[PDB]
Design a protein around this nucleic acid. Structure first.
Lengths: 72, 50, 77, 121, 136, 107, 195, 99, 192, 93
RNA sequence: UGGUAUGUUC
RNA sequence: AUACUUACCUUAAGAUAUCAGAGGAGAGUCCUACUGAUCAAACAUGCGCUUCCAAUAGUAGAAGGACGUUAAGCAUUUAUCAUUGAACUAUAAUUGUUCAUUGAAGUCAUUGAUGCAAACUCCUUGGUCACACACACAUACGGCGCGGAAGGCGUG
RNA sequence: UUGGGGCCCUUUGUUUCUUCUGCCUGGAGAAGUUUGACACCAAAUUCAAAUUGGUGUUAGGGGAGCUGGGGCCUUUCAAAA
């Protein structure tokens, strides 16, 4: 119903966490009312590194939160 | 805790001194990496036979 | 640049026909590689030329209508 | 605990009771409800969250059990990750005193509407 | 570091954390009773908290939060379990505790006033500037 | 054609409920929400032969002194796995579906 | 539809852009702050006393208590207790609002004063200060104050103000004392202080 | 066709038409011919029983339930006969009908 | 909708030769004026031509490498010229209303009564009378103190600070109309 | 429509709250802007992972279905949403 | 047929 | 407070308990201060009903805690990996032993964490009530005082 | 009206309905009470003062009259043995 307020994350690097460990750091290009996240230049971070193509789209069901890695 | 972004004045903020942070302890359930139902559920063909 | 919504992102991803790596649920789930040919509003994605590889010897699978509730992540390989 | 919870009451009648609500984990929240909704989202006044450790679980399997209690105060709990709710403790003031308090609230609300009608004129 | 002269912020923060975290309402009395014997610069705020918390008493049984009952029976000649009309009894308790607090306030006031008017009103720099600076 | 209205006709019925956690709940039904949030009284609940989370959920409800006897339990809909009705009740008269009969007469 | 419980104002169909703009406007701020202040004042000022339980006391306690002494009750008139309780309420609120600010004015010439104590070049909470400036869309709010800002930037180094005594400092404030117990100060000082 | 733009109060007729001529052909055949079906559930509780009613949520009333599960430690099979049951469609993995 | 799944189904059903009158050419090129004034107080109602995202993506892919269509650009230029002429007529009506408010009957009568009494020492008295007449004119103009916006044709203020003005410039009407002026100036620079 | 708990979550905007996630990670920080779908955004966030460690995020945004609970401050104990018999002053036509 | 918020003058 | 400008928006519907019968309105639908039955709510009302309501003929004690002390109490368990150099046990990305250069994050906590157990102190609650300091009971206990708190059943 | 005895005064702003006077050699006196009144918070108007927005209170016990309901007794009518 309501569009989520991700307007402040328009051209900033974010870090999604997926389900307990899959930290996908990317640049938010777009979102929906379902928290599906479009990321440009994604990067998997493990506690090693893994690249995830040029663009990607990530399902909002597995998305828990997201850290704003870049300053606003 | 000292300086805020809040639009309320300092007299409201002294009334809005929040609770102390929560004392963390070790969790009890399995983490969400291990949260799943049961695997290796066998087929129902053995019930139709015997 | 501008905003790119996820439905138009998947639509451009459908038009370009890039090689696709589709992830799924955790350790029981198996990562699939293919090419997208159709989707809908519940994100039931139809893929072709599917080779499945488990989490760290792939087997061909054909054409697959993968349902929405198990889809986690989509990348362009 | 000899409380004798009401035999034909629902969530509109169980309000301001010291609930002992159980979740899927077993993280039991104890506190007074003050609101609910269709999804059973419960606000909890003076709430405490109690658990049992993994070492105490062996003693609990067939006596004293050392539960771990953390204090949450006024929280608002969601209805997704909860399992069951019971009534643990009765409130302070009684049903007749709550009835007199509700009549005073109704008279105060009618006086406030008369004050708004006087200020509107 | 708790015996510092300009440590009003530290003890205000510590009393705030005790008043926010503790629910027994006993450690606050103990720490504030310790502060009423320490020569602090900003000391009268703690005496004002002490005097308004004596005013915030509710019954005689909270006098055991201050001291023990034998020290009340011997030094102040007052009993906790004395039942009867407890109005003027608690008023006389407040007056005698206010007199003891006033005497200890005179002691700490003379100490802080001596340290300020002789020594602390002259030092203007209390920080580390540089190895190249000059102090008067 | 929701069968929660079938359970709304099952007041003062002495049933059992097996939950998804594994707990068997023996008690009488008082009321049930249309979202199947069912309240029960005169309850004893038991975790059979294990699941330590279910044992924690069994003990941490007050009234344990592993049969736990409780006075009043509300149960959420998604935690209900199955509910067993008493065999003495006639299912041919309680499943008449008068709303479905009115919908068929309205056609 | 949307109804504000604070401002007692209605609204059209529930738009997030209208509801977000409603919680920023000054009337909602005044009504909300006054309501929170009055509810906090009511829950402080409500003297919920215990219900008294009087039992039939023992005999020897009655022969001991009625023979020791009889104490004197003090009591005051209406205007006296009203003035005293009003002075106690203003003292309680001025103690609840005050705080010790000696470390801010005591390390004023420190070389890292512009990095911690300035409260705008702070690292963790400085973005919160720089975010909501209360941008003063009224021209009168910007034209009212005509004093200096004195905004100390982070880039101030030790080369500026080398000698802290030549640039005129302030003498530190004396330790404040209680005005009700001000008559017991030593009237004779130890040393002769001029001016 | 979109669900919200079909009609008002005539969706029950389309639901009955989907019940008669859709995936519900097996739950309809079991309740009119009283044949026993085998429902496998999400916690190894296999149920052999006859279907009494149908629901949109697949909430099924079962009569003369013979249920069976397997405890794996070592390997034992534990069964139970339950007269009346109201099964939720959340737990249902699959439904098999015998000819 | 009350559920988001019906909203996503609506997005799918509206997302999934080309020279047809059903396709809105002003939206096919971009920034349709019936889209930039959808829910505001200056709304035109509803666009009679249909808007689509797949046709817009095909037009973007064609204009990226393939070719360009001058007929849709000419139709968008004609629509922008008609809307700019309507907005210029509205701005001229607003300027005429401001000139009529500055030249009211009682205001001109008071100004003539002040100037009739406006006539070394005589020069100083005339300068003081002219300063009093200027103060009276400033008090008459300060009763409204409403300027004219040079672009969007709205009303502004001079004593108002820059923050409320910046809040005024960030609206749907002003952003849409500045985009339409930029498109009109680009098409007039390309045509001439 | 919305209900009392989502109005209470929208009430305490700009205040220090403490979330707990479904995994066990407890967040604590100042609520930026809450929504009706409870997808809440926090600032000056201190985080405790279920492994135990403590870290600090600057600007977090968590989805509403992965929240165990959230703690509002105690002065919202007395709210007009809790009033049962509050009448309505003449809603518009 | 309207509502919310904000800025000037009396 | 009046007058004006600007920013955003201008609304998912249908209904208010169920069953049977009679009448009216041009097989289907609506209405009846129409009739019988069930159920719900409110107000009263009674059931030798069910549970609880703290000494004062003393200086106690019941319920819930301490996010209180003794208590750093007693008994246990852990406090980073890799390359190389001087020896080396050696199936590992030299794992093991002594010393070091370097490389990525690097919970604080070891007065830490878990289990066990006693004593002391302090908080919130009550009818701290009316008579008496008394010889009853296999149909086991004269529940035949004024109330309050929670609940069951029955009637208007 | 006076005097004596027992208890309570934590009513901690010494009755807490409000205001004023006033109190432990006492426990009081006067006035008012729901389109009203009382107390308090916040503010710009540069002391005080005044204006605006809100918060909370307006109580407890006894008695005459009226009314609803529960139980017992008496008088009269209709019906069944």
């Amino acid at each position: 119903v309501s569009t989520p307020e991700l307007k402040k994350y328009m051209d900033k690097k974010i870090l999604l966490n997926i389900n307990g460990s899959r930290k996908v750091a990317g640049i938010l290009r777009g979102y929906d009312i379902f928290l599906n996240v479009v990321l440009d230049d994604a990067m998997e971070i493990n506690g090693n590194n893994h690249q995830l193509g040029l663009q990607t789209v990530i399902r909002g069901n597995s998305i828990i939160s997201l850290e704003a890695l870049d300053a606003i | 805790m000292n300086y805020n972004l809040s639009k309320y004045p300092d007299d409201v903020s002294r009334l809005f001194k929040p609770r102390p942070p929560l004392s963390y302890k070790r969790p009890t359930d399995y983490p969400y990496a291990k949260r799943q139902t049961n695997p290796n559920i066998t087929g129902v063909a053995n019930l139709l036979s015997t | 640049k501008a905003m790119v919504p996820p439905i138009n992102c998947i639509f451009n991803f459908l038009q370009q026909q890039t090689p696709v790596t589709i992830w799924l649920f955790e350790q029981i789930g198996i990562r699939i590689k293919g090419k997208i040919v159709g989707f809908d509003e519940f994100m039931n994605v139809v893929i072709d030329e599917a080779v499945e590889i488990p989490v760290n010897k792939g087997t061909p699978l054909g054409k697959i209508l993968l349902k929405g509730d198990n889809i986690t992540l989509i990348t362009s390989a | 605990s000899k409380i004798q919870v009401a035999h034909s009451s629902r969530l509109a009648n169980l309000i301001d009771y010291k609930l002992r609500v159980l979740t899927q984990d077993g993280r039991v929240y104890i506190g007074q409800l003050m609101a609910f909704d269709k999804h059973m989202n419960l606000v909890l006044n003076e709430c405490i969250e109690e658990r049992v450790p993994k070492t105490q679980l062996d003693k609990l399997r067939p006596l004293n059990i050392k539960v771990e209690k953390r204090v949450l105060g006024l929280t608002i709990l969601r209805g997704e990750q909860i399992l069951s709710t019971v009534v643990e403790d009765k409130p302070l003031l009684s049903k007749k005193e709550r009835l007199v308090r509700d009549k005073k609230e109704k008279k105060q609300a009618q006086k406030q509407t008369k004050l708004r009608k006087e200020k509107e004129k | 570091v708790g015996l510092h002269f300009f440590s009003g912020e530290f003890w205000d923060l510590y009393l705030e954390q005790i008043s926010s975290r503790c629910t027994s309402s006993k450690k606050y009395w103990n720490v504030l009773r310790k502060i009423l014997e320490i020569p602090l610069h900003s000391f009268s705020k703690f005496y004002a908290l002490w005097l308004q918390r004596i005013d915030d008493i509710m019954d005689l049984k909270q006098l055991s939060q201050l001291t023990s009952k034998d020290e009340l029976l011997k030094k102040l000649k007052i009993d906790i379990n004395y039942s009867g009309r407890k109005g003027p009894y608690l008023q006389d308790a407040k007056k005698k505790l206010k007199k003891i607090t006033k005497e200890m306030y005179m002691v700490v006031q003379y100490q802080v006033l001596e340290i300020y008017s002789i020594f602390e009103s002259k030092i203007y720099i209390n920080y580390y500037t540089s190895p190249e600076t000059l102090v008067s | 054609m929701k069968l929660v209205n079938f359970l709304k006709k099952l007041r003062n019925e002495q049933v059992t409920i097996e939950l998804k956690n594994g707990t068997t709940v023996w008690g009488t039904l008082q009321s049930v929400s249309p979202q199947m949030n069912a309240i029960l009284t005169d309850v004893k609940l038991t975790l059979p032969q294990s699941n330590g989370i279910a044992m924690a959920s069994l003990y941490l409800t007050g009234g344990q002194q592993n049969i736990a006897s409780l006075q009043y339990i509300n149960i959420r809909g998604n935690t209900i796995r199955q509910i067993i009705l008493p065999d003495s009740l006639n299912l041919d008269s309680l499943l008449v579906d008068q709303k479905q009969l009115n919908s068929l007469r309205r056609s | 539809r949307y109804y504000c419980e604070y401002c007692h104002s209605y609204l059209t169909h529930d738009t997030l852009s209208v509801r977000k703009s409603h919680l920023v406007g000054k009337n909602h701020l005044r009504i909300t702050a006054d309501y929170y202040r009055n509810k906090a004042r009511d829950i402080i000022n409500k003297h919920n006393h215990k219900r008294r339980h009087i039992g039939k006391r023992g005999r020897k306690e009655r022969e001991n208590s009625s023979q020791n002494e009889t104490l004197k009750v003090t009591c005051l008139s209406n205007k006296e207790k009203r003035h005293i309780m009003h002075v106690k309420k203003m003292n309680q609120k001025e103690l609840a609002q005050t705080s010790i600010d000696t470390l801010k004015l005591l390390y004023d010439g420190s070389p890292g004063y512009s990095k911690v104590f300035v409260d705008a070049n702070r690292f963790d909470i400085g973005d919160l200060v720089k975010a909501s400036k209360l941008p003063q869309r009224a021209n009168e709010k910007s034209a009212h104050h005509s004093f200096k800002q004195t905004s100390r930037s982070r880039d101030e180094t030790c080369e500026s103000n080398p000698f802290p005594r030549l640039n005129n400092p302030k003498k530190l404030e004396p330790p404040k004392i209680l005005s009700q117990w001000s008559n017991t100060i030593p009237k004779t000082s130890i040393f002769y202080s001029v001016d | 066709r979109p669900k919200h733009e079909l009609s008002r109060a005539e969706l029950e007729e389309l639901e009955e038409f989907e019940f008669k001529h859709g995936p519900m052909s097996l739950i309809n055949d079991a309740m009119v011919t009283r044949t026993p079906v085998i429902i496998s559930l999400r916690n190894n509780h296999k149920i052999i029983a006859r279907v009494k009613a149908f629901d949109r949520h697949c909430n099924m009333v079962l009569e003369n339930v013979k249920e069976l599960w397997t405890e794996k430690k070592n390997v034992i099979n534990r069964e139970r006969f339950i007269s009346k049951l109201f099964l939720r469609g959340d737990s249902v993995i699959v439904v098999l009908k015998t000819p | 909708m009350s559920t988001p799944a019906a909203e996503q189904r609506k997005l799918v059903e509206q997302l999934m030769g080309l020279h047809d009158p059903k396709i809105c050419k002003s939206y096919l090129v971009g920034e349709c004026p019936y889209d930039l004034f959808q829910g505001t107080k200056q709304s035109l109602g509803k666009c009679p031509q249909m808007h689509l995202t797949k046709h817009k993506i095909q037009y973007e892919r064609e204009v990226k490498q393939g070719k360009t269509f001058p007929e849709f650009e000419r139709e968008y230029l004609a629509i922008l010229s008609r809307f700019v002429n309507e907005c210029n007529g509205q701005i001229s009506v607003a300027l005429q209303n401001l000139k009529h408010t500055a030249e009211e009957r009682m205001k001109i009568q008071q100004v003539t009564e002040e100037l009739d009494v406006l006539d070394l020492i005589s020069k100083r008295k005339e300068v003081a009378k002219r300063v009093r007449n200027i103060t009276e004119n400033v008090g008459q103009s300060a009763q409204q103190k409403l300027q004219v916006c040079e672009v969007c044709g709205a009303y502004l203020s001079r004593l108002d600070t820059d923050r409320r003005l910046a809040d005024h410039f960030l609206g749907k009407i002003h952003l849409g109309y500045v985009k339409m002026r930029e498109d009109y100036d680009r098409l007039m620079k390309n045509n001439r | 429509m919305n209900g009392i708990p989502v109005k209470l979550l929208n009430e305490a905007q700009g205040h220090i709250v403490s979330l707990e996630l479904t995994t066990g990670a407890t967040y604590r920080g100042k609520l930026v802007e809450s929504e009706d779908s409870m997808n809440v955004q926090l600032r000056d966030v201190i985080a405790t992972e279920p492994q135990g460690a403590v870290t600090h995020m600057d600007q977090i945004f968590v989805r509403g279905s992965q929240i165990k609970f959230i703690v509002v401050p105690d002065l919202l104990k007395n709210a007009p949403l809790f009033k049962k018999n509050s009448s309505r002053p003449m809603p518009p036509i």
